[PDB]
Design a protein around this nucleic acid. Sequence first.
DNA 1: ATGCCTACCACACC
DNA 2: GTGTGGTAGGA
Length: 268
Amino acid sequence: MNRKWEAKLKQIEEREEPPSIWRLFHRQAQAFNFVKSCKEDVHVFALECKVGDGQRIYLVTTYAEFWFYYKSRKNLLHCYEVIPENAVCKLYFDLEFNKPANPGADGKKMVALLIEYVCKALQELYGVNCSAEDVLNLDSSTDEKFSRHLIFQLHDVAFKDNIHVGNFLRKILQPALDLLPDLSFLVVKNNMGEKHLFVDLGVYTRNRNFRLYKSSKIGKRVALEVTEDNKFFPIQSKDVSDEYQYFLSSLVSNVRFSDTLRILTCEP
DNA sequence: ATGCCTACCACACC
DNA sequence: GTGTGGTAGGA
Ligand SMILES: Nc1ncnc2c1ncn2[C@H]1C[C@H](O)[C@@H](COP(=O)(O)OP(=O)(O)OP(=O)(O)O)O1
Ligand SMILES: [Ca+2]
Ligand SMILES: [Ca+2]
């Protein structure tokens, strides 16, 4: 209620060919206005400008059409998915830690330990069954930063929205947050030596952008790619490429339609 | 013409 | 030691 008000208060302050939808907007609110008026299943992507800052331009189109002009990786570099507020979404993680500050850290093993804990939490709290085979593991690491994105592919399950995902993780990670069951493997140090969590809990905000599979930040050149030890394999289909399957799986807001979907909620 | 909002501190107040 | 409130900085 107070979330919408500020959203529209800032909007006034800053105020035959084949079927193809490809609309750009300078403001995020305009893009979502178009989505509400479009009868097709279109979504909002955030595109970083040539400027060095985090200035974004917003694209609206379908997943199929976006992938058409995106897969070559010649154009549409540095793209982000906009996770809409109040939209059902998958369980996803942003994992980071500075390598110099953590010499003994084995990120590959912290990830495995994290997945096991989260899978146990989902079982005890929601009766949801899942394992590492249901977790799309993406990597964007460099010499200086260990970086991974995890996107859970739960069978006929989703969270009410990404805010509720955050509430779920803050709840089950409260032990680790106190260090700042034994969750100490999640504790890492940043460039200044301050103890932080291996799980970045700041990416569960309204309209959070989330770097797309095979995209990099405008400053760098390292793009998100399926990790070497990734264990989620989409069901192969003769009608779509494997890469498109991974793309769809990687989209946090692309909740597969199911006639028996369970929606998980979690309040603060 | 990007969006979002927590960690942090200064200040009452008890 | 609780309670707001007001802002700069990171994602
Ligand atoms: N300045 C910004 N404005 C808007 N959204 C942002 C901004 N910075 C980051 N985000 C969003 C997009 C990112 O995918 C997400 C997580 O940020 P962050 O972890 O810093 O980068 P990343 O996880 O995409 O790559 P990496 O972690 O490897 O640098 O938050
Ligand atoms: Ca990250
Ligand atoms: Ca992060």
